[PDB]
Design a binder for this molecule. Structure first.
Ligand SMILES: CC(=O)c1cc(-c2ccccn2)c2ncccn12
Length: 114
């Protein structure tokens, strides 16, 4: 059922998820687990939602995928205090993805597609 872009995005998503072994970013954050969340965070995102979007072929480019990844991390760093596991893990994931999906890495990949 898959396409080349879907396989590349599944690769990036798997590598990001390895950083979150307990699955704190695996499913949506609800108001039950996080008080007032829907008041503070306008556009929720999580790794499960991203996987579903890849499978449905909703992402046209690495840029569109990268935007959801950063949104997920940015929501966590805005809602949670800096002394929490959620804030610190989000900062770790953000750094990982910026390295993995840099313009330099994407250029090397594009050169290998010749
Ligand atoms: C990602 C996130 O911000 C998050 C995940 C969780 C979470 C999700 C499931 C089980 C345990 N923790 C959470 N709890 C309180 C405040 C914030 N969070």
């Amino acid at each position: 059922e898959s396409t080349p872009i879907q396989q590349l995005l599944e690769h990036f998503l798997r590598q990001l998820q390895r950083k979150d072994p307990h699955g704190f970013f695996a499913f949506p954050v609800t108001d039950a687990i996080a008080p007032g969340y829907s008041m503070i965070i306008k556009h929720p995102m999580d790794f499960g939602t991203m996987k579903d979007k890849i499978v449905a072929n909703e992402y046209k480019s690495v840029t569109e995928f990268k935007a959801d990844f950063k949104l997920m991390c940015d929501n966590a760093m805005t809602y949670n205090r800096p002394d929490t596991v959620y804030y610190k893990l989000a900062k770790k994931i953000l750094h990982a993805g910026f390295k993995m999906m840099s313009k330099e890495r994407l250029l090397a990949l594009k050169r290998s597609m010749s």
